[PDB]
């Protein structure tokens, strides 16, 4: 269709709007202190969220140039708890405020490349730093601590979270399902984990954890594509749920029967690394490989993983598997492929049962074990730093590394410098305090991991009142941040549909 | 879809049009002097009504972001007469004053956090007061004479309420049904109560009292979720034979074929299975042996059908928060072996949480169900009467809990005792305490509003500066000893109107922004 | 869907307005010289009326709020003519009054409660006071000559229907049907009727004959008594009727009348035709129906009479023995072409119902002049305080108001001396406004039934009461 | 339908409107230094692209005759990255400005004729001059070193594109796909291509690329025209896709609802004219395994992969003597176009297997490869000249051979003169500095290749430094712009419909 074109300062200018009114909305529930965001809904009551995830994913403008940039930062900052689990909105805060004094100084003359390359060596040097004062979590001991404090001081759980990373490793595959009563119990069971999600976002079963629950489905496995094409196969099965494994006109079919009240299935994805293992799926779920001259428990899938818990094969057929795997390896960069697949059989997955007195406090805990456990898992890659905000601040001190080739990629190490305390500033603002601008003195004058606490509005130290951010989460959040925010800095031209 | 977007004082002040909308048009029927309220209908003549939940219901606005405040107030609001089967328009009355005082304090500098504690220290020490001035209800006398009031000084529904009580205990399931003459009687027959809503409004018979009744049904047990309505259409199709509505128990669009085949032709209701896990299997059993039926679990919902494994109850009544099975038609036989079998797993006492777990589903199937027949000389006299033992044994269900105070709004005045143990760290929350403290006299001040007089103001001073039970009586616009007159309130009912009240208050002062769909 | 909502003096400003434009459209037709209106068709001419009840059933609003006012004095209004014959007009002009000048005060000041405390105590005693002047009237000399005012002045109908209450008796059953031929007869016929009626609007034919269905709790007996005679289903579920304590004990009465027996050890599925009971013709419209020759065993019907022959209910059920031992008289007009007989058929049908009303409350002077001699009641009323007080006098000048809008509709702009001239004399001394001359109402025929009079006041007061208690308006967006 | 009609200045100024919100959108993607461009999406994120390939197909405007000379210059300057493999964005640029100063001469009263043909005249020289100052590409060993800059310094890719010459020749044909694994391999097995691509868009199978992809298909060799009649033998192969070959309508548009729908995957080419069409019918036979007009006469083999202007078979079905014997036949007769004939059979096609580490690398190498390739060819074909813009300022010495009969003529020689030195201008605009007037006359003054390099942002020479464009790509972006400069300049009228 036809278009409508911006060009520069009023294309970036724009774009702008649209992303100030994504972070001011979002930024107001950041931190203990965030403030409650009513969305409306097309009957009954509205819904209060102090979750800056649940406020940004309902953010939508009718201009498209303002909507650009309001998705881009929503996309980019999304990204950071896909991997890690927390800090969406902390990273949107911080790529408002590196796109606002950015632009003031492309305003100002200065180039925006150099910006950027300001921008990016300030961030390296702050991500350096902020490893600086990461403390790494490993052992059962301090792993627990870590999913106590994410489980609001439940020592329960941590032990449940550190006893099963001390099975399958701290690379190992977690699971958490509902228990059959009070008590929560930890078992291992066969099963396998793959890079390969959903092929359309219809297939999820629960918006709450954006995964789609299969309960005692069968699987289907082939090794061509998609576009349905064998209607037999597919039609007689309805008579469990179906997860399809191909390796691609036939999805529309598979989705409007995900919406339909039968025949409820989903669609993921699988050179010859992939044919070896539709056959090692194959032989841990019992199923048959159809490539050979074949013609026509639980499994979870999220949007970058699948998850099959207790496929049911024979004991003794998939051990088989094992010594296949292993005996090449003795006959043989390569072989570093091989030897993953012979920990995803031998592995297993361990299951999480939760349970609790009724049914309501069964999915509270089952709800804050997920939590715990997706924070747990970031702690023991990356580390830990200190919460509220701080250590960001504490990272500032990095920026003297930082190389300027000239006054404009200056200006663009000043950017982050002052953008790494909005993320404080705005968790003392969420208080309704007009001190504010004190309160950071304090905690920038400080040393360590002395800060301001939201919650009991005292200053103490926060690790020790157990405020805490995974290092992934807060180093994400600023890399992210500066890359959206280096893109729409760098951008000249905004094009969009006519109405 | 695109959204506008509201934030701080534009925001709030944009809520509260909605809340004064709600709270203005449901106020003038507070109290026994409360006015009437016309609502227009499709065609004929409207609706006049004093019962400000029935206002309450008919309130949506046009206005999107004032709509949300409105809706907001409604739904916390009605958790109060959910519970404690009174006090809604007390909430929203409440729930004015605390919202409109909040924001003007708001405006004037002071932080709304700081306020929310203030108000939240303030009811703590409120609803204190109210259980030391409570009277506690226990003992068949009194337990009919709090009956007598909320029937309207009828002493037979009192005494009945009272002995219906005596025999189920204080939590034993006892239910309102017509009967067959101008006699009124009471019976205890089998049958137990598990929480469990309809999947679905459109199940409901009466919209009146949104419940699903079903008399003579038929009960199908099954354990699992059925997403097919196809297994499950024999057996379905053999109880159109029978002609007797029917009620599915399983775990759980499906149910869309059902909801939609029962309102348009041809009855029946699904609810789902009561607890979970391990704990659900055995409790299926339960509803099952009671019912006269078995449980269908790895049998088959396709093949294996019979009706000797379809239970059968008299009446079935399912509400949204419950589902009533009365006067089941399983044998006395096998429900005592089924009693003693979990008395015998009581009596080994392994853990101390299953002790009591299991008591749970003994005392269902022990009490089982007292039913009320209330009846008249003609019919819509039994429809008038019906409905005051209704709301009779829901406010004497409630006396029994929390006890009664001082009617009138005078109990709300009387616990402003309590505001001196009330501690503020600043001056922000001692703000938030005098909100509640205002507060506490706006009920009485729109009930004395009410009867026309431009007196009111002279009528709470009157009031306040009085002690104990003496207040101002709005029917006979009589000052008197308000419980010695028969005016009073369950403690349930006056502690959740202002613990609502300030609740949905708290939430709207925290609130910086409101997102709405663009028009 | 979304209200708009008016609140106080807006609210009740409004509802005024539609309760205006029904009663000014209405109050036209009051009185013998009430007015005309014409009322739009959709083809064609339009009609004309000069009834009441007629350009009221016609009256709807576009403004959702003045509607309401409208309908709710429709509504109320309405209910008098349930059992009148007259006065459904009369009824929303006094509520046109009450509420006006009850908005009146309360503009100035004046508490609504007080005020409709003051229009109920003042109305007990105008209906107390309307029971002493209203005479009762009994015996076939009176009967007939109410009969005859109510027939438009034909003695021989109100001799028809004073012959046949003296059969039946005052309470008794008169059923009306159509002549075979010129003759007018009168015979009493044995049967029955209750107070119920057909289930739906359908089925209006409802003469069944040789009906041959009593079940008392909520399929295949249909299909058998349609071979082998229209059935009648009287259940609490080609005809249906609806059916507490003294429901069942009817249900036997019937059967025994009846050749049938009652369908608790009788199931419908299962139950013989034998036990289905057959009259001979049975009419049912809407709030009656009528069982006429029951074709039941002559010695079971006299031994149940037997069988019932402590104070409320010994009287209830006393009630029952009228219905075994008393008959249903029928009634057949008939005249020389189907014009002048359907016609005819209808004054006798509006004549008994004007009789029986008389015959109940008894009868009072018409012109409206009941209301004002009623009046001299509000002496006993009491006030307790001036908002009261205005109250009783809402309903003193609320009472002439009928008789002015009959006068009114004269065309005459000296209306306000015929009003004087009324309440300055004493007794039945009265107006009639169809010779236009003054004289005694009663001998000049000029009446109307006690029960119509106050039914109307005590409607109006009652409607206008709810409307000046009215502090809010709930309507949809449009 | 009823018609709106602009004459003379009125219709050229408003088509250079359209002009120029292409080239304005288009150009500011130009160089090492091109600034990104934010294309809109229905819904999400929107898409981010430096590719000025990628926004030139996505300008369309809502005014008609501004879309008329948006399209004109789009489709024209399209054909430079056609046959060239890039140089499309320069071509918009140069046409820009050609017409730009084309107008503002004809506003001063040059007859727009004379105007057109100064710039042929000069266009003639600048392309001479471009031949002479450009070098010729041969060997092994200059041909890896042309890959391996395409490639952006992989040594590996650049060895494999000169391997791949060495066997099939200069002119040879060289198919990329990808491999099975890590390994990287090369193959040559026997096939052929012919100029006639696919009848109808429609039977894409892949997107993006302008082509589509059959694999595993089967070959139909068909003498006559196709208009449901010879459907009998269609759906004896339908229980693999097949390529039907013939002459060509009411038939064809049966094949494009079911390319669509996904039933029955098809692809029609038109037969390689008369009785030379008929002869090559035969050799698309003997070599696919074939017979020209039952499921025996239908030949396949390997992976048929279809281009709009082009249509390749892979492998063939024939035997190793069956192609021997027509191979004979064709040779049989001995004493131009004969040579061709036989050169296609005996030459073969190399097929480039491209693999790495994970899959998702796998697909960035291998686009990695196929513009290398692309790129190669046109460096073998007319040589490499030195990029950065300074190709086409160098080439402006050859004006003085450009002999100009009258003022408007020379008029025209100089608006290509100015023109020649827009794209460089354009390139140093992109790096945000507003000294770029200095690098331009810097650059001129200096001879041979010392140029500007904007990836570095500082001056050296560019044909050491690894900047380098193929010379049929410079020479045919200015040949493309003064093409459409000269139609535009020359339009007198202007029709489109009523709206
Ligand atoms: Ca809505
Ligand atoms: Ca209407
Ligand atoms: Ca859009």
Do not use: C, W
Not at 292 to 301: S, W
Not at 317 to 344: V, W
Not at 423 to 432: D, E, Y
């Amino acid at each position: 269709t036809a278009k409508d074109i911006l060009f520069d300062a009023e294309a970036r200018t724009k774009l702008k709007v649209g992303v100030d009114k994504l972070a001011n909305a979002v930024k107001v529930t950041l931190g203990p202190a965030g403030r409650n965001v009513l969305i409306d809904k097309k009957f009954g009551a509205p819904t209060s969220t102090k979750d800056g995830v649940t406020v940004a994913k309902e953010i939508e403008l009718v201009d498209p140039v303002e909507n650009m940039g309001a998705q881009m930062v929503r996309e980019v900052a999304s990204k950071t708890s896909d991997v890690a689990g927390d800090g969406t909105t902390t990273a949107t805060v911080l790529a408002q405020a590196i796109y606002r004094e950015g632009l003031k100084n492309v305003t100002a003359g200065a180039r925006p490349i150099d910006l950027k390359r300001g921008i990016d060596r300030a961030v390296k040097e702050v991500v350096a730093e902020l490893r600086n004062i990461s403390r790494s979590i490993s052992g059962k001991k301090e792993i627990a601590q870590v999913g106590t404090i994410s489980a609001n001081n439940d020592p329960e759980i941590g032990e449940l979270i550190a006893e099963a990373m001390d099975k399958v490793g701290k690379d190992g595959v977690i699971t958490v399902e509902e228990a059959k009563g009070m008590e929560t119990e930890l078992k291992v069971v066969e099963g396998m984990q793959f890079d390969r999600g959903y092929l359309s976002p219809y297939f999820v079963t629960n918006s709450e954890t954006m995964e789609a629950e299969l309960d005692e489905a069968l699987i289907l496995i082939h090794d061509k594509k998609i576009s349905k094409e064998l209607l037999p196969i597919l039609e007689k099965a309805a008579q469990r749920p179906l997860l399809i494994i191909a390796e691609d006109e036939a999805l529309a079919t598979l989705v409007v029967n995900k919406l339909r009240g039968t025949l409820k299935v989903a669609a993921v994805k699988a050179g010859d690394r992939r044919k070896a293992m539709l056959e090692d799926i194959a032989i841990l779920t019992g199923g048959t490989v159809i490539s050979k001259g074949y013609k026509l428990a639980r499994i979870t899938i999220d949007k970058d993983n699948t998850t099959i818990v207790e496929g049911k094969g024979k004991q003794e057929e998939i051990k088989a598997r094992i010594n296949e795997i292993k005996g090449q390896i003795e006959k043989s960069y390569d072989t570093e492929k091989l030897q993953e697949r012979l920990a995803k059989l031998s592995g297993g997955v361990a299951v999480l049962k939760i349970g609790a007195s009724t049914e309501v406090e069964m999915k509270e805990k089952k709800a804050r074990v997920e939590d715990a456990l997706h924070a747990t898992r970031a702690a023991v890659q990356e580390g830990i730093v200190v919460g509220g905000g701080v250590a960001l601040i504490r990272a500032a001190k990095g920026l003297a590394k930082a190389v300027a080739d000239n006054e404009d990629q200056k200006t663009g190490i000043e950017i982050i410098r002052r953008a790494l305390e909005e993320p404080l500033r705005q968790i003392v603002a969420n208080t309704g305090t007009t001190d504010g601008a004190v309160v950071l003195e304090k905690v920038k004058n400080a040393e360590g991991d002395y800060g301001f606490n939201a919650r009991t509005e005292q200053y103490e130290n926060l690790i020790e009142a157990g405020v805490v951010d995974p290092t992934k989460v807060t180093r994400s959040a600023l890399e992210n941040a500066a890359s959206v925010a280096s893109i729409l800095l760098t951008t000249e031209a905004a094009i969009t549909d006519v109405k």
